[PDB]
Design an enzyme around this catalytic site. Sequence first.
Site, PDB file in Angstrom:
ATOM      1  N   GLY C  15       0.824  -1.198   0.000  1.00 49.97           N
ATOM      2  CA  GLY C  15       0.000   0.000   0.000  1.00 49.97           C
ATOM      3  C   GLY C  15       0.861   1.251   0.000  1.00 49.97           C
ATOM      4  N   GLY C 108       5.766  -2.392   3.382  1.00 49.19           N
ATOM      5  CA  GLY C 108       5.254  -2.929   4.625  1.00 49.19           C
ATOM      6  C   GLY C 108       5.947  -4.207   5.047  1.00 49.19           C
ATOM      7  CG  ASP C 156      -1.079  -1.738   7.628  1.00 46.91           C
ATOM      8  OD1 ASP C 156      -0.722  -1.053   6.645  1.00 46.91           O
ATOM      9  OD2 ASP C 156      -2.056  -2.515   7.596  1.00 46.91           O
ATOM     10  CG  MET C 198      -8.446   0.404   5.287  1.00 47.54           C
ATOM     11  SD  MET C 198      -7.861   1.254   3.807  1.00 47.54           S
ATOM     12  CE  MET C 198      -6.101   0.916   3.869  1.00 47.54           C
ATOM     13  NE  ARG C 200     -10.011  -6.427   6.077  1.00 46.43           N
ATOM     14  CZ  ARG C 200     -11.225  -6.803   5.674  1.00 46.43           C
ATOM     15  NH1 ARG C 200     -11.513  -8.058   5.353  1.00 46.43           N
ATOM     16  NH2 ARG C 200     -12.182  -5.885   5.577  1.00 46.43           N
ATOM     17  CD  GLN C 290      -7.558   4.552   7.790  1.00 46.22           C
ATOM     18  OE1 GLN C 290      -8.671   4.126   8.090  1.00 46.22           O
ATOM     19  NE2 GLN C 290      -6.433   3.985   8.235  1.00 46.22           N
ATOM     20  NE  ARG C 555       6.555  35.621  -8.511  1.00 40.99           N
ATOM     21  CZ  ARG C 555       5.416  36.219  -8.841  1.00 40.99           C
ATOM     22  NH1 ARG C 555       4.245  35.806  -8.375  1.00 40.99           N
ATOM     23  NH2 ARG C 555       5.449  37.263  -9.662  1.00 40.99           N
ATOM     24  CG  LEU C 651      -0.612  32.697   8.681  1.00 48.44           C
ATOM     25  CD1 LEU C 651      -0.027  32.960   7.300  1.00 48.44           C
ATOM     26  CD2 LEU C 651      -2.077  32.323   8.555  1.00 48.44           C
ATOM     27  CD  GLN C 653       1.837  30.075  18.965  1.00 49.47           C
ATOM     28  OE1 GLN C 653       1.576  28.872  18.968  1.00 49.47           O
ATOM     29  NE2 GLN C 653       2.814  30.596  19.699  1.00 49.47           N
TER      30      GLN C 653
END
Lengths: 223, 761, 761
Positions: C15, C108, C156, C198, C200, C290, C555, C651, C653
């Site tokens: 995953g 995983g 997981d 999710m 399992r 998730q 930029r 912004l 804080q």
Amino acid sequence: VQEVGWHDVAGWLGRGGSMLGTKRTLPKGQLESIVENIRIYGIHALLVVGGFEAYEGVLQLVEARGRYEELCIVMCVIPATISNNVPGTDFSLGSDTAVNAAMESCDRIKQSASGTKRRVFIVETMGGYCGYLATVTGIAVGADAAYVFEDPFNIHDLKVNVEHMTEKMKTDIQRGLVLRNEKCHDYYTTEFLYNLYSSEGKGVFDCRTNVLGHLQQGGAPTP
Amino acid sequence: ASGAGKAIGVLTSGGDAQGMNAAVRAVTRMGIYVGAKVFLIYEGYEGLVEGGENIKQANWLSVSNIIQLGGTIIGSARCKAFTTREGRRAAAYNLVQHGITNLCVIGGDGSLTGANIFRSEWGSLLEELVAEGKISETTARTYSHLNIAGLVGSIDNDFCGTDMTIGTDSALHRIMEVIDAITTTAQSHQRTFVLEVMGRHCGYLALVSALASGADWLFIPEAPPEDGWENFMCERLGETRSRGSRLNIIIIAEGAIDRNGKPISSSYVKDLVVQRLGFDTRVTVLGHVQRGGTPSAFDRILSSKMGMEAVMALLEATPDTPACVVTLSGNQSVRLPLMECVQMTKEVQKAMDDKRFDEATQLRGGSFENNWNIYKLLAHQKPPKEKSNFSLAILNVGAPAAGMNAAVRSAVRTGISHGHTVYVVHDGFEGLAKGQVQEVGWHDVAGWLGRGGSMLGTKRTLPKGQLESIVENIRIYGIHALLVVGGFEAYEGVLQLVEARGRYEELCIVMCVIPATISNNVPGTDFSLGSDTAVNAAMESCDRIKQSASGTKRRVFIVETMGGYCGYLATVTGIAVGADAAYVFEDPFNIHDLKVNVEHMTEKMKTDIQRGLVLRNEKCHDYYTTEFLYNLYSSEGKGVFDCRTNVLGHLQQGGAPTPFDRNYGTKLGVKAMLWLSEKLREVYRKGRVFANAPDSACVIGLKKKAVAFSPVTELKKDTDFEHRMPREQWWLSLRLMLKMLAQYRISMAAYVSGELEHVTR
Amino acid sequence: ASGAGKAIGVLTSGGDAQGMNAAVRAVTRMGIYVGAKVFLIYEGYEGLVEGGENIKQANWLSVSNIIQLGGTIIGSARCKAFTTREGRRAAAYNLVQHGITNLCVIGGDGSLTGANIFRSEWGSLLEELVAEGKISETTARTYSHLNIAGLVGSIDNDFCGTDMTIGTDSALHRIMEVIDAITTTAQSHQRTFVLEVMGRHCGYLALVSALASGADWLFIPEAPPEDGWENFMCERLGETRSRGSRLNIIIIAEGAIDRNGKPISSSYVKDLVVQRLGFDTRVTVLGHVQRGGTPSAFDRILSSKMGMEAVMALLEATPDTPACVVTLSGNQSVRLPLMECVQMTKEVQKAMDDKRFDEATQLRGGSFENNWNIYKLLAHQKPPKEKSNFSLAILNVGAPAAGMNAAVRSAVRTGISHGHTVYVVHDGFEGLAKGQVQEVGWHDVAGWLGRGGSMLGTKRTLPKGQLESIVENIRIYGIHALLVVGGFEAYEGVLQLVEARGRYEELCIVMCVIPATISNNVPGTDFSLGSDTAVNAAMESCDRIKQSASGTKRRVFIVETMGGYCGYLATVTGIAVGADAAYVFEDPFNIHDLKVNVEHMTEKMKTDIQRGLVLRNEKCHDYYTTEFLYNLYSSEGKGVFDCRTNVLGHLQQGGAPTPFDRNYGTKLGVKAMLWLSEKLREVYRKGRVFANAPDSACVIGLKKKAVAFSPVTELKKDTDFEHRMPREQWWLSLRLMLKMLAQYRISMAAYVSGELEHVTR
Ligand SMILES: Nc1ncnc2c1ncn2[C@@H]1O[C@H](COP(=O)(O)OP(=O)(O)OP(=O)(O)O)[C@@H](O)[C@H]1O
Ligand SMILES: Nc1ncnc2c1ncn2[C@@H]1O[C@H](COP(=O)(O)OP(=O)(O)OP(=O)(O)O)[C@@H](O)[C@H]1O
Ligand SMILES: Nc1ncnc2c1ncn2[C@@H]1O[C@H](COP(=O)(O)OP(=O)(O)OP(=O)(O)O)[C@@H](O)[C@H]1O
Ligand SMILES: Nc1ncnc2c1ncn2[C@@H]1O[C@H](COP(=O)(O)OP(=O)(O)OP(=O)(O)O)[C@@H](O)[C@H]1O
Ligand SMILES: Nc1ncnc2c1ncn2[C@@H]1O[C@H](COP(=O)(O)OP(=O)(O)OP(=O)(O)O)[C@@H](O)[C@H]1O
Ligand SMILES: Nc1ncnc2c1ncn2[C@@H]1O[C@H](COP(=O)(O)OP(=O)(O)OP(=O)(O)O)[C@@H](O)[C@H]1O
Ligand SMILES: Nc1ncnc2c1ncn2[C@@H]1O[C@H](COP(=O)(O)OP(=O)(O)OP(=O)(O)O)[C@@H](O)[C@H]1O
Ligand SMILES: O=P(O)(O)OC[C@H]1O[C@](O)(COP(=O)(O)O)[C@@H](O)[C@@H]1O
Ligand SMILES: O=P(O)(O)OC[C@H]1O[C@](O)(COP(=O)(O)O)[C@@H](O)[C@@H]1O
Ligand SMILES: O=P(O)(O)OC[C@H]1O[C@](O)(COP(=O)(O)O)[C@@H](O)[C@@H]1O
Ligand SMILES: [Mg+2]
Ligand SMILES: [Mg+2]
């Protein structure tokens, strides 16, 4: 420490600044070194020519007399500073020179708008929190206002003075001048006053700015 | 190319003209820049004779921080030994002991005459010296030729071959500082001010002072007064009283005489005025004050330029080329042979000794005679029995500039003298559209010389938006000519009128621009009227700022100057004040250049020199502002120096005009009016004026050597209208001198030095 | 030292945990920084098997602008071929064709198990491959050893040997973004929110989500509910209603089971709650959400660090060292042998299959069991039949920091559970002086987890000024311990009270400092509580700012971050956002460094990358401000890029705490209260508490590996009080990773990588 003679100070009258070096450093940090050199050179008296730091340093030596026997020497402070901020006198040595240089710049700045043009100049003066230099310079130059720390002003006072300037600039006087002491206000800086006067004076007068920096400092002493 | 292996001697002699230190500094630093050894000869020909200790090799720091000092750090002395061969041989000996085959002499006419006789006898002196046994025959075949480059340093301006000498401008500053004390006062009593000036055999300072101050009367040895001047002067002062003019100015040279040899004393002129008029009369005698004070900006720039050119002339000089005098005729650097200049000085002296006395004034130079004629013309209104149908309007356009009022004064008097109907318009083209036109008389411009700014109003507005109103008012008032005294908007406005001639017949009128602006950004001239005043005010502020750090403290000052995109003001001000760098738009710089300059400043600041000064033109860079440079210099200079900032705003603008600006505006207003009259007569046909050709719309122009009327259409090619400045500016070569004097190793192969030119009879 | 002449393969499988792109980017750029060739293997073991087109060599720009992307640009696939030797031999063949003796696997537990079996058979596969004739014996003796460095990329956290995996933090961001949608509204009806997560077979996400959200009930496979939980849960929800709590949160893992094998469905829990309580019950199922969204800041930093450390471990690995998994236990990087981690995963799986089922939860890791115990303790007030005379006051000092409220909640519950009399003082030391002391209960801190800022007031005022008032209020309220949650001022104030113990007997009380500040400037810890929230907010702003050009215009953005003199926030934010430079006080920079960086940016900006981003800490430099850098970058980048500026003020804080900050503050609040209770019992003698030793006043740590307690007096040596930060900060080694990821050739011999460590049983 250098022993001096008659002719070692020859021609020192008209010389501005300081032939001897100047430093702002107070004596408390190096007090052991000061008492040592007083002992070495047998200094029985101390003549300190300077600004607020001169008075403060002599005060520190007087307060330290209890700790050090050598500091029990006669002391004299000659107040010498641009700001005229030294307690114990009305005129610090060299404040007159600074005032004369300041007005000369302000008279030049005021002379620069010519004929029809209606213009206000915000001039920023030195002097620290001491407003003396600004206020006397404002008197000498006919300044409309001299904003100083000792006379705290808020935005209500500023609107009063700006409307006063606006009505005056509608009359036949065309060259306004306000002074700003460098440390008069925390927020209403010279840029603030430039923005305020130029906004509210829109359609009546233009606004310009000049920060007299060290133009008020290095000149030869006035008579 | 470089002058390595050869030694340059520099000495000053005669009266210590202020600006000598600038010339010595430039000579020294150029000489060691090009690899030559520089030897400072103290007390002039005195120390040349005695030699030994009086001749010392110079380093870069030997001439540091002297450009603002008047007098001369080298020192000057009158010695009779150099007059005789006994001491002159000793002088040649002392030069040979140091291998000094190259000599720069900064002095008056007597100094340069002695230098000429010293070169003329250099071979004979060396021969007699080797014969007597003080130098071997070898070591005498080398040094067989002595190279002399003369610099005329004197307030007298008595050296005939040369138009402008070092210290004349500053001596004029001293004079006009004293006269402005009288004239700028609110006049209360009826009084007479008699000024005595030191010229005993040359009346030039008395003349240019009289022209600058608008003196009522002038006594100069060149043109003594006619018999019975006693009555004529007293009557002139009488009608001056009747006019209501409460102050009279009498300029009297020390060498003032009558048509006979009898001198006229200032005390005699005092007692004369007292007896016949009764005015409160006091004599002012300047004495030593004329040589005193700081050198003016002009004196510092020109002394630096001529000192550099002296060195370069001294390196490119072969055994055959003669002794030269490095001078500037107009704005153009030139080298004149020393012998011809000395010969002319002898001819004028002999003429002034009642030989060709009436014709001695012309041999003093066309400038002197022209200056005196302009003075007398502007002094007193003579009756213009001639009349003309022509009518002309005088505009002031753009920002105010010092000397606009001098130009308008001369243009008014000169136009009235030619019989023209003179108008002024207030507020420039705004008033010409609004019909703010006023006919003006002789006395309506009275006392306008020393007034700064603009007595007429000034506006920047261009005529294109009110072209209909302008043609209407031209038709109403019958304006046949248009004199526009102003900056870039003056030229651009006259241009818009010339381009609009095709649409409007009424705009086919003779137009003349007098460039008058602080920035010196007007095409068709080298100097705009009032740029000199701005430069002088700028250096005075910079000198004050540079003097504020006392001798211990290491500080750099970022000083921001005006001038728009035109960098002239910043760069010349940097030369005058010894600024390390003058950042300007015309020399684009990036962060690499800034790091080079800051590191250069840092290294310099570790040495004995403790006050740095970088200038920044207000519009030199989009991002690297004054605040940017402050942060940069203060950060990189941490632990070495502190940084401070000072934006000279309108401190450079509102001052009264310097004496150069007064005389310059005076002369250009005359010259513009002369050319206006000539063009109008040339263009008047079919009973009306019809000025359609491009030659009818000119900028007066001071360009290189002479005044030069440049048509505005032709100048349009060389005009950067976006940046409001010309595309090719003469002064970019001065950047090389600026950077050289601040130790920047810049290959100045692009600098052009004035070539040898014979004297113009 | 450099890994030249050798090739690294990087693949993702399983995953697609968000943050994989950051790990792949760091692996690629470190691999080609150290001279090795990097090969991107697309679709994981799928493309390993088929090979050919699926294996492509990487350049620096191949992983450009992916750090903010979730999922994986390499792509992942489930392949059964790698399970069998037929496809595994083809995988070994394809690695040999490219000379890839070095493999990084980011996946995983199944991915790393397959990598382990692939190494274990690498010799046998190569032998059978040369036997079949697809590779010569020469070219097989080389590549005889395959180096595997594993990275655990999964939401997981099922790999037992490892404490934290890539994507766990961001999966929790998704979960808490959804739970905050429920909890932050003004609650109206009585309702139950059942969240199906999710997991399992692993219940870690369900557990940390429950702890972060304060779930009423939790179903996890590791600890199935006891028999009759149906009634016990419904009664808990019943008293929750009686309390007036209008919202219930049920967290149910997909793998939720009972003590038998029967799974518990979210629908069953819904219908159960509906039937017995009647609350408005709806199930929320996240599903693919998730794995979605951007990776969190933590995930980007840690993925970058572990990817770099994976490459370095892959170069320093000899034929003898085993396959390793690069992970972090605590804040310390570590390498664990792949075989032992796989073995532990098999043991826990067997235990979970009703072998040692009650004792499987401990083998999952001590952190899991501790988290579940903390969760249940804080969830429901059990009756504390024990009581103690001890009483403690909880302060909030300094600026507000996200997670103070979570810490205070846990401290209150844990202190009440231990029988202590818990006080809270509003406004910190100001209130302690003013006596704003309020005894607190269990439900007075209800719902304080997700609330940002500080429910209790915060003030920066140090206690020295009002020390008489503080000792008076401690005496009045009988305060035996003091828990101070705050920034540098919290530590400094507790230090002042410890130093004043000699003067005042009452100040001899146990003290504990929980570091809670945005700046992460508190000595004694690696992560101040709420620094993670600030970093996440700052990168989210920087990501938004960097996206504003949208690939067309090129930029550079100068972003200014907070943090005082502490540069932590700037540097980690620069890592998370791929900033070119993060200027900080701790790394002093001059104009030479700025020109290097600007030229570096200009060269990069001419390439394919178009969006530049440099960060500046607010107090990094005295003169080179954000305005200075704007002017510099915009000037030097003229004709290449434009420059823009954004000062992120508050912004960074006021945001709600990230799930890390909630769980972190929860845990160290519990641990501080445990340590307070133990110290107070160890110090209670003669019928009163007298805490005079330095160990009685500590800062709760988490300093390298696990939680620590540093005495404030001992930390005074390593504290820069002028700059309000520690003198030696752990995070300065991350600058080298920041600079390396931005193509700065920096000799990173000072970086230390985690060494091999066996699993902790
Ligand atoms: N403003 C000044 N700046 C620098 N040097 C100065 C200034 N004024 C005078 N001097 C120097 O002081 C020197 C000493 O001579 P000065 O004329 O000034 O007084 P003095 O006769 O020597 O003694 P006294 O101080 O009693 O008057 C001079 O050589 C001069 O160069
Ligand atoms: N005909 C000459 N021959 C040789 N040396 C001369 C001659 N005239 C002047 N000098 C020398 O030059 C020195 C200075 O000359 P002088 O007295 O005339 O002043 P100056 O150079 O003309 O400057 P100023 O006019 O401004 O006062 C004299 O001391 C003298 O030694
Ligand atoms: N401002 C003045 N200063 C000095 N002398 C003056 C001034 N004005 C006139 N004079 C002199 O007075 C004399 C007679 O003056 P006036 O101009 O009126 O008659 P003039 O014959 O026409 O002389 P000019 O040649 O200048 O035209 C002249 O010698 C002239 O030089
Ligand atoms: N700098 C100045 N600023 C303002 N007014 C000035 C200045 N200088 C002179 N004036 C004024 O000019 C007035 C005219 O007299 P002034 O002495 O200047 O010349 P004048 O004799 O009248 O004529 P002329 O221009 O030919 O010299 C004086 O009353 C004086 O007030
Ligand atoms: N015992 C094994 N032997 C060989 N290969 C294996 C083994 N287990 C898994 N793999 C391979 O690893 C790939 C992915 O493994 P898996 O299906 O278990 O997902 P994962 O790696 O554990 O990631 P996540 O749990 O987050 O979904 C599989 O397609 C398979 O090819
Ligand atoms: N918030 C919760 N979520 C999930 N299960 C819970 C929660 N609270 C209690 N439980 C479970 O309910 C069962 C009984 O709860 P309770 O704590 O009241 O009795 P206990 O015998 O003391 O269990 P414990 O070992 O935790 O102390 C336990 O199996 C416990 O795991
Ligand atoms: N971000 C938030 N801002 C403001 N109030 C909040 C926020 N989150 C939850 N609350 C409030 O907290 C209150 C208490 O209920 P809450 O769901 O949060 O937890 P609780 O069940 O009451 O107790 P516990 O803290 O143990 O979980 C709610 O009424 C809710 O209004
Ligand atoms: O008030 P003081 O300290 O006595 O000295 C006056 C001078 O110092 C100033 O504060 C400025 O000094 P600096 O330029 O070095 O910063 C001004 O007030 C004035 O130029
Ligand atoms: O260059 P100009 O346009 O000819 O005039 C020069 C003056 O105008 C300036 O641009 C400034 O004018 P302002 O103060 O009114 O804005 C300066 O360059 C200088 O003081
Ligand atoms: O570093 P501290 O003092 O612990 O608190 C962090 C906060 O305080 C700040 O200094 C700013 O606070 P203020 O806005 O009130 O001035 C920032 O660093 C940050 O927002
Ligand atoms: Mg002479
Ligand atoms: Mg898995």
